[PDB]
Design a protein around this nucleic acid. Structure first.
Lengths: 97, 95, 103, 78, 97, 83, 105, 93
DNA sequence: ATCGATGTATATATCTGACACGTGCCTGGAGACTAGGGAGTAATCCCCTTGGCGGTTAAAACGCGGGGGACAGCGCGTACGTGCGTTTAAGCGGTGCTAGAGCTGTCTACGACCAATTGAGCGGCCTCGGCACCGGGATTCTGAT
DNA sequence: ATCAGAATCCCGGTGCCGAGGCCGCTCAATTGGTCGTAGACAGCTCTAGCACCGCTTAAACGCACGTACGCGCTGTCCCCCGCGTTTTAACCGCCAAGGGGATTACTCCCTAGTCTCCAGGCACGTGTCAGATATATACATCGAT
């Protein structure tokens, strides 16, 4: 069969709002952190717990940004969050010009 | 074999007061621990700012009370102030 | 002890040592650690009590971070106190915008 | 290597956020936003680390970095 | 009667109230509003004149910085008029109540 | 001498002027009531802390330093009033 | 050179800064070079703001830096504007900036 | 019978930067509050850095990394340069 | 499209309050010694990070078709802007009262400090339960029928 | 409606590991006892906050009218979604190397503390000039005509 497009989305929403485990994968994020820290002081090291904390912080940040972005999109009568939605949410929270 | 401080057993005792059958998992233990640290650092920082603002050298219960009235929002503030007054008063009641 | 003298569970001695060796002021009135330990214990009892109940709703006898997040974010004046605090392994509040629901 | 934040992972983050329908350009924008946030936080973490004359960014360094950004993070021995 | 096309006077008023810097809320009604709000906290307070002026500066700064974000939200919804849903979205994104 | 209902001292042209400074080109008619509500909420949140700093100083006069301290606490530092 | 300020080539008072660091309860002790460094940083930041403000004043053909000019200096400079983003400036006004959609065609 | 401020030092810096531009009274109040704000920020950050490391003294190292934590990029680099220059000169001779 | 005239911007003459400057005192900055405790430095242990790998499998990536949501265009009605005339109450000055901020002396309670000591707390260790889960059953969703 | 095909929810046996309880010990909290001083209390002084009146006049209000714009409606198309298949690389467990964190012992120098000058800074008072406005003038530009 086939679900009317727009209901697997609500089901995934409910599934990911009952969960707590981290959504971004672990090793990709770890390599991202190490790459970004390569540009500040070469040959660093990372306590595994510190990478985990960076991931918790980043995921909480992105989740909040997408909540506010969804609010902007819904405000424009749309349903799909678009780039200008993220740009407006950040320009109002005061994160970039 | 050092002695690292943390509010583990204290939060645990308050838990056993308020839910004599509910345990608490080490990660939620760490969260309660960092919550105690965060709130205590906020309150003491505001008490310090009060003291220096009025050119005093003592953080007395007056400064802690005004810190609580500044940080915690309305109803939480009133009930926390009551709890602290009661504790301090009881402390004065002993010797 | 000195926490028992005040009917507290949080250690007034430790809070004194931290108000003294923390450089918050030169002097610390002996009635300050008591007040502060009481406010900390009250807020911890508040958090743990709301947390416990949520865990009991999830028919569980063991608080985990999710339950702390549910308690802190459902209560209106605990939210405002920890409005800028992310709780590790906390998840979010189940909340689907009413415009997105089917029709 | 930023591409490690795959399209489905950003999709999952948006689901948790409550986003129902996601455009196609949200992915590049979100990679950019994440890279900015990580730049700032890891910059402060590495600053605290360098100042402690260490070479391993520890959990307390990232916790302090986030507190300094104004995003206090409970749960890592704060 | 002779009349500019609507929008022109609003444009020149934007120019004029962004050049100048004098306080915009009329002073005495703001002093009265401050005293009336303060009565609910401690009866018979006295307000240093400069303290009332500091409150007025902060309040005008906040309302101007809120109408900026409101205008951003309104333009984001392909409108020109700002409307209470815009103000409420701005304040919900910023983090206020 | 009690005062009541001075939130209508933030008149319609005053809010219109504040908006025109903010850049707004055309204001809807229900902006006035929402703006008065917003202004009153902000003012309460600031004057509560101003009065609390006062009472803790045992004074009975809200200094400008108390207002500045209240704003610095709300996270909206104000420059130009001493301290 | 007698006073520490002149010995450090600054203009901000190294001594007053040392006192404020001591009777401010930031730490039990305050190293010798900490007031020097902190006063140098304060002097650099105020020199930058006053330089930009003076330029903003010279633009409008005035001779006195009023608050309007400090606001123009701070807001119109990305790095200061990031350092002073949460800072209202009394009498500051706002940057003259009409949104790009509102202008007529 | 004294009140502290920076009202004269900022004036010296002004005359050193713009040798013929006065500064109003309210603008002097603003700058006098800006210096106090940056001072409390850098000092509070240095205090946090003293405790986070179980140090006790605010050396110049602490103030330096505090300036790096607070001021954004190029302001941070230039401020650190000015600080180390002033410190080194003070150490000299 | 010219008027035109409204409005903006440019030019000079005047006034005046704010500022830039010249003193007199004073108190806080600076200097010289002393002392001791905080920080540097070296040695050593051992944990904990990094790297490498092999396998498996869940997840990512890719193709595709289709439908549903974004976006543009149009119409229509309202509701916001604009101009005038009338009303209101802010702003200013001036006076007058006084409540309260602010400074100062005295003096006592209170808190720092030090030495003894004693129990509370931390760490290692171990036993039990509580949660995850698998599985089977039952009910309730979504969607074509 | 209905019927189905999953999706979700309930209930129960089961394993694993992590949390909760116990025990030993060392170290920080407690308790006296002493001393210095912070701060409280009162009392004086005078600044500044409040209250009020009367005028002038700029701003707020109210009203009328028109037109721009918000909003609903419709139509088209493109671009996400959902699904099935193929690929890829994350997870995990294990092992080895060794780098660096953390601790301890020793030593030195850097800063606190104190006392003794003395000049940098602040409040006072004063003279003047930068800027706001008046009056006059040149030109942009909005727009219905």
């Amino acid at each position: 069969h086939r679900y009317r497009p727009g209901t697997v989305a609500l089901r995934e929403i409910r599934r990911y709002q009952k969960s707590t485990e981290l959504l971004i994968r672990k090793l990709p994020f770890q390599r991202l952190v190490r790459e970004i820290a390569q540009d500040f002081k070469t040959d660093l090291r990372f306590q595994s717990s510190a990478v985990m904390a960076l991931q918790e912080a980043c995921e909480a940040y992105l989740v909040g940004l997408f909540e506010d972005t969804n609010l902007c999109a819904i405000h424009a009568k749309r349903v799909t969050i678009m780039p200008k939605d993220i740009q407006l949410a950040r320009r109002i929270r005061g994160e970039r010009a | 074999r050092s002695r690292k401080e943390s509010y583990s057993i204290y939060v645990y005792k308050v838990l056993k007061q308020v839910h004599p059958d509910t345990g608490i998992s080490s990660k939620a233990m760490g969260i309660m621990n960092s919550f105690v640290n965060d709130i205590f650092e906020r309150i003491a920082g505001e008490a310090s700012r009060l003291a220096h603002y009025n050119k005093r050298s003592t953080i007395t219960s007056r400064e802690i009370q005004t810190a609580v009235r500044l940080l915690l929002p309305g109803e939480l503030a009133k009930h926390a102030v009551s709890e602290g007054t009661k504790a301090v008063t009881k402390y004065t009641s002993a010797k | 002890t000195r926490s028992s003298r005040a009917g507290l569970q949080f250690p007034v001695g430790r809070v004194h040592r931290l108000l003294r060796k923390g450089n918050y002021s030169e002097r610390v009135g002996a009635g300050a650690p008591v007040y502060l330990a009481a406010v900390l214990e009250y807020l911890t009892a508040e958090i743990l009590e709301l947390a416990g109940n949520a865990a009991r709703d999830n028919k569980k006898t063991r608080i985990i971070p999710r339950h702390l997040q549910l308690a802190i974010r459902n209560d209106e004046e605990l939210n405002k106190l920890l409005g800028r605090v992310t709780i590790a392994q906390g998840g979010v509040l189940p909340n689907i915008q009413a415009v997105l629901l089917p029709k | 290597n930023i591409q490690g934040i795959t399209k489905p992972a950003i999709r999952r983050l948006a689901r948790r956020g409550g986003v129902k329908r996601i455009s196609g350009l949200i992915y590049e924008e979100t990679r950019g936003v994440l890279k900015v946030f990580l730049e700032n936080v890891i910059r402060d973490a590495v600053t605290y680390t360098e100042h402690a004359k260490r070479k391993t960014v520890t959990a307390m360094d990232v916790v302090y970095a986030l507190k300094r950004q104004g995003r206090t993070l409970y749960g890592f021995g704060g």
